[PDB]
Design a protein around this ligand. Structure first.
Ligand SMILES: [Ca+2]
Ligand SMILES: [Ca+2]
Length: 74
């Protein structure tokens, strides 16, 4: 079950969907854009709560290693 390049690319592609400006972090705005693509209508505060759940380093936004937590949710 060793990590594959296929999986790594899947993780990077998924991160990039959210991180649309390529700056390496997912903001509330970026997360909101993906939520709205899914027909959802979260508020800024709700988006911040979503980020808070995985924002290990407390900088208020999602980086790539934090995003992996999301990929692991069942
Ligand atoms: Ca970004
Ligand atoms: Ca963070």
């Amino acid at each position: 079950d060793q990590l594959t390049e296929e999986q790594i690319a899947e993780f990077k592609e998924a991160f990039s969907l959210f991180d649309k400006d390529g700056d390496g972090t997912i903001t509330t705005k970026e997360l909101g854009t993906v939520m709205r693509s899914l027909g959802q209508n979260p508020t800024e505060a709700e988006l911040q709560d979503m980020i808070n759940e995985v924002d290990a380093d407390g900088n208020g936004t999602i980086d790539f290693p934090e995003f992996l937590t999301m990929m692991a949710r069942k």
